[PDB]
Amino acid sequence: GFLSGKRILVTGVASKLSIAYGIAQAMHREGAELAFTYQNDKLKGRVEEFAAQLGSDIVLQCDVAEDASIDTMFAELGKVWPKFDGFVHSIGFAPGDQLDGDYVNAVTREGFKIAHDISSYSFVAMAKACRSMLNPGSALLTLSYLGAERAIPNYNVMGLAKASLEANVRYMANAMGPEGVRVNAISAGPIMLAHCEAVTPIRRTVTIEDVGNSAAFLCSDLSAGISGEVVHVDGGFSIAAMN
Amino acid sequence: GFLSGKRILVTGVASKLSIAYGIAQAMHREGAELAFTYQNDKLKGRVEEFAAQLGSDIVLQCDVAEDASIDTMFAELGKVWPKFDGFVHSIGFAPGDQLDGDYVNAVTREGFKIAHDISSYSFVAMAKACRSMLNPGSALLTLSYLGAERAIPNYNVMGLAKASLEANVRYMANAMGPEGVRVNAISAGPIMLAHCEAVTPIRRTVTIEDVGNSAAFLCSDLSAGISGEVVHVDGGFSIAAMN
Amino acid sequence: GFLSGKRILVTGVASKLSIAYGIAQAMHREGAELAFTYQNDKLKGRVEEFAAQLGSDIVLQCDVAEDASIDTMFAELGKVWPKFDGFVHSIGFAPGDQLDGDYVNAVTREGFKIAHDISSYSFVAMAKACRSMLNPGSALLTLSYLGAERAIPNYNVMGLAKASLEANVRYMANAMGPEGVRVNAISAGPIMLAHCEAVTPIRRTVTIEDVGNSAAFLCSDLSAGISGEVVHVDGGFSIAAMN
Amino acid sequence: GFLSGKRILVTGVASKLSIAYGIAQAMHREGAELAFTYQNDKLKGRVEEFAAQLGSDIVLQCDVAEDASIDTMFAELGKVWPKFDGFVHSIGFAPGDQLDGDYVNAVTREGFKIAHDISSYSFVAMAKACRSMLNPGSALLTLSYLGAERAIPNYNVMGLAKASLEANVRYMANAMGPEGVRVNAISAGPIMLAHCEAVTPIRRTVTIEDVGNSAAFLCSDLSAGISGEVVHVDGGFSIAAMN
Ligand SMILES: NC(=O)c1ccc[n+]([C@@H]2O[C@H](COP(=O)([O-])OP(=O)(O)OC[C@H]3O[C@@H](n4cnc5c(N)ncnc54)[C@H](O)[C@@H]3O)[C@@H](O)[C@H]2O)c1
Ligand SMILES: NC(=O)c1ccc[n+]([C@@H]2O[C@H](COP(=O)([O-])OP(=O)(O)OC[C@H]3O[C@@H](n4cnc5c(N)ncnc54)[C@H](O)[C@@H]3O)[C@@H](O)[C@H]2O)c1
Ligand SMILES: NC(=O)c1ccc[n+]([C@@H]2O[C@H](COP(=O)([O-])OP(=O)(O)OC[C@H]3O[C@@H](n4cnc5c(N)ncnc54)[C@H](O)[C@@H]3O)[C@@H](O)[C@H]2O)c1
Ligand SMILES: NC(=O)c1ccc[n+]([C@@H]2O[C@H](COP(=O)([O-])OP(=O)(O)OC[C@H]3O[C@@H](n4cnc5c(N)ncnc54)[C@H](O)[C@@H]3O)[C@@H](O)[C@H]2O)c1
Ligand SMILES: CC(=O)N(C)Cc1cc(C(=O)N(C)Cc2cc3ccccc3n2C)ccc1N
Ligand SMILES: CC(=O)N(C)Cc1cc(C(=O)N(C)Cc2cc3ccccc3n2C)ccc1N
Ligand SMILES: CC(=O)N(C)Cc1cc(C(=O)N(C)Cc2cc3ccccc3n2C)ccc1N
Ligand SMILES: CC(=O)N(C)Cc1cc(C(=O)N(C)Cc2cc3ccccc3n2C)ccc1N
């Protein structure tokens, strides 16, 4: 497969419907060796089942709000993977009240803080901690959403976190690039669904399978000439207007 | 002038070199009535002197790091300007260690938090705090930089905060528009300089005059059709390549 | 006014509904001295009447499809304005059959040629023809539309010509900048309308007044730091999504 | 391979160094069945040798300036490929005088015409002619360059043609999307080379091999969720500033 011999860490697998599940699925098909992290114990047994299926034994706990937690997970990972080739950032979050209604009235200092810390910072937080472990030719991937670029109703402060994150992807790529590391993002279509379906050129919303293959590609040597790019896997929805 | 009839609040004056000082002058020259803010004891005496030269005596303190400092300042403002036409938000901050060297090695969870808190959240926190006081036809303005769109060396976490900020401009613009408020941004060229003067289409870096003139317009009714935009006042530096 | 001292050439007036008519008025209100152009016999009498109301009597013919029509018009201009401060290029054209239906089935090799020739090449062809006559501090302005950046139904080949046009603005801006000329563009909202009024942040389509006010500024020294930019005067319609 | 069973037409193979050569190379490796076109007789024997190597027998003549020529080639192609799955547009052109020196002085009406017709129009010209032959799941690919988005010295009018072409890619995708056709572009880094090498994050220019794999991916079902996107395969050069 095109990921044959790559050891990739996969974050964010919460369920079978998770974009991370669709992404691991594809990296696996393409011969990548996977490892997974889980936020808390609620999800341990589940993530362990998913990993077993995708052939890995590496299921490490990791809460991205704690620097120390991230450090710890990279120590355990290190016991089996002294060197690896990148990870998949598929973490995002904001307190619920934040995401409904008028942005200006919904947003709060604490809400803004959490949204940027979990959704934007965690990406560089992890990069920072596994930087010396990464093999040349490694690639880091994160997921963004059109809300970073356009004002979308209800997405509110999650839109700023994603803008921050897309900038993160350009600064990380410029910093890590020289040492053989590429970093990009995939702005996925919504996985309202009806409207998108009708107004999207391909006339259908993407699936974690569509996003999965783009993720696999981007993390593989096939995309070697690509770094710092936010690739839209939304079926073209953002390029059309007034359809 | 084209701002006569406008009561506008100007933040961020720290010196005669400050951008808001150039904005203040221009808004004053065009007929505006201004209110000023100073961050602390250190800057108070300096802001009061300029407000006097500009005919204003509305000089209030405001630490955007405190929601209470914000509410209280707008409460003192209501006592003199029950309603006004918008404010210029020319505040930005990142801890010393942040803007130096390899982005990834420099950035820290807290340097990140502070940079976003002060440079980005402070914008919406202020509109949040004064929404009711705004008149239809009101325009809010912020200041950003190219590092939001591109990875500029050493700008590091500030670039990410400028991205969150430009995203904030869109979401705020979209939410407030219905009540008669427009929200824009000026991505000003750096007021490196020699490289910019050599490669900028107009062949010179921009001045606080250039920036002030544009801010004055973005806050006047002359720009009634412009909302949610990030206007580049950098002499065309960003639209050139390998000059 | 902010344009007093400016001698500016205005093209594209065909009626009181025309965009250049709104631009002309505003540039006149601000102190500008204007020269006008009409495309043909049909429009002559109409342009001459407005020029009279605006205090001008410099009404010259110009078919941008002919390099000779251009040279000759600028030759008659030199006889009254040996030098001037820029011109507004508000010309655009695509053969009937083009802007109707499936883009791919509509577009023809010649509809393409004409659309690009008149809507895009005519911009640089005019600056080419009057370069020597320009004063430092001179600003050139064109009009574009969102269909350049996004695929709008029925806009078809015109979208492609607007893209070539916006690209023309950058290249012209970069080449001419050193001599004191700035070159910008206004991407105006459509002067469909009901959909736009409902989804536009300011909740109303923009007027030729809104557009004129912005053009007047983009052609004044107040915008000295803005060159090679495409300013969106569409009430923020383009920065919103799924409103 | 991921192109197993795809029949793709490849335009623009002029030499071993041609981006089209690097692209066919990769589609071949991935199991695609190729067919090639050649501009004129000068290149027939050569293109026939390249094709033989990549396992095809289909070497059709095609001059994109002639509608009739394009039609003819699709008739011959049709004899062997009644249905196929897309083509690779790797054609670009402008008269030489156009590409050196000051844009404004270099550009001409005829030069502009040719550059847009050959570089931009030909893409839709071909699409138009094979539209009923294309199989659902087909994909069309073209090559663009950063000159479309930034003002690059000497690229002059080629920059406008590419802007036109990038818009073409969005209008074609929106029109053909509903019938199961995706259309995208790859903005390739320069294949000055020294400067790019030093300022590009990956610290090296891309190769036709890097561009080749991205082309293969984009034309394969792996990229199914992608249409109307211009993907930058430039090693991140355009995302960084002032390195
Ligand atoms: N659903 C979509 O349409 C869509 C589209 C584009 C982008 N995105 C982004 O893709 C990413 C994946 O989203 P998803 O749709 O799979 O949703 P999800 O809820 O399945 O995954 C988000 C992940 O974030 C994790 N998480 C939250 N806080 C964490 C923390 N403190 N530490 C570690 N993990 C934490 C959760 O465990 C979860 O695994 C998200 O960031 C999302 O915004 C989603
Ligand atoms: N001058 C430039 O080159 C340039 C270029 C592009 C963008 N900018 C932006 O312009 C804005 C001002 O820059 P400048 O050069 O005029 O700055 P300056 O250093 O003269 O002023 C910065 C202001 O920010 C304020 N500030 C910081 N923390 C604050 C807080 N806690 N509470 C209230 N105020 C706070 C200070 O009081 C200060 O007056 C910033 O957002 C900056 O990022 C400046
Ligand atoms: N009104 C809108 O909704 C709108 C919105 C966005 C962009 N635009 C752009 O604004 C510009 C004018 O549009 P409008 O609605 O004011 O137009 P209008 O129809 O009132 O005027 C168009 C002008 O183009 C001129 N023209 C065409 N071919 C020409 C040629 N051969 N020589 C000289 N002149 C030529 C005509 O003389 C005419 O005056 C165009 O570029 C258009 O694409 C208009
Ligand atoms: N060289 C680069 O760095 C680079 C980077 C990005 C994009 N591009 C674009 O990639 C495409 C491929 O370029 P290349 O570098 O392989 O150069 P090339 O000269 O090898 O290929 C361009 C092709 O255009 C063809 N052509 C010209 N006129 C034609 C016509 N009338 N009909 C049919 N074919 C015609 C030539 O036969 C040639 O095969 C070009 O459009 C180029 O602008 C090049
Ligand atoms: C609690 C939590 O972990 N959060 C919030 C993270 C999170 C964010 C998204 C998202 O980024 N999306 C584009 C979907 C989405 C969420 C949403 C909320 C309001 C409006 C639109 C919305 N869209 C499209 C998707 C899944 C997800 N788990
Ligand atoms: C400590 C602090 O209060 N900060 C950071 C706020 C602040 C930021 C800027 C800025 O946003 N600019 C583009 C200049 C600038 C800063 C900078 C840092 C590193 C590299 C380039 C840089 N440029 C152009 C300018 C003035 C200023 N007071
Ligand atoms: C024949 C001709 O002289 N043409 C085309 C020039 C021309 C173009 C526009 C335009 O560029 N606009 C965005 C409106 C517009 C035209 C259009 C066509 C189809 C769909 C939407 C459309 N919109 C918004 C407006 C006026 C006008 N005179
Ligand atoms: C005659 C002909 O067939 N033409 C012009 C098409 C053509 C264009 C390009 C190109 O689009 N490039 C980015 C390279 C390139 C050409 C060029 C010219 C001037 C400046 C930079 C330049 N770059 C980067 C490359 C190859 C090529 N054959």
Structural account:
Chains A, B, C, D: Keywords: Antibiotic resistance, Biotin biosynthesis, Fatty acid biosynthesis, Fatty acid metabolism, Lipid biosynthesis, Lipid metabolism, NAD, Oxidoreductase. Chains A, B, C, D: GO terms for molecular function: enoyl-[acyl-carrier-protein] reductase (NADH) activity; identical protein binding. Chains A, B, C, D: Catalyzes the reduction of a carbon-carbon double bond in an enoyl moiety that is covalently linked to an acyl carrier protein (ACP). Involved in the elongation cycle of fatty acid which are used in the lipid metabolism and in the biotin biosynthesis. Chains A, B, C, D: Belongs to the short-chain dehydrogenases/reductases (SDR) family. FabI subfamily. Four copies of one chain form a homotetramer. Chain A is of the alpha/beta class. Chain A has a single domain (1-243), classed as NAD(P)-binding Rossmann-like Domain (Rossmann fold, 3-Layer(aba) Sandwich). In chain A, 40% of the residues lie in helices and 14% in strands. Chain A has helices at residues 19-29, 44-53, 67-80, 103-106, 109-130, 158-176, 193-199, 208-218; strands at 7-10, 33-38, 59-61, 87-89, 138-144, 181-188, 230-233. A seven-stranded parallel β-sheet of chain A has the order 3-2-1-4-5-6-7, sandwiched between helices. In chain A, helix 2 (44-53) links the parallel strand 2 (33-38) and strand 3 (59-61). In chain A, helix 5 runs parallel beside helix 6. The termini of chain A are far apart. The complex binds nicotinamide-adenine-dinucleotide (4 copies) and ligand ZAM (4 copies). One nicotinamide-adenine-dinucleotide binds next to helix 5 of chain C.
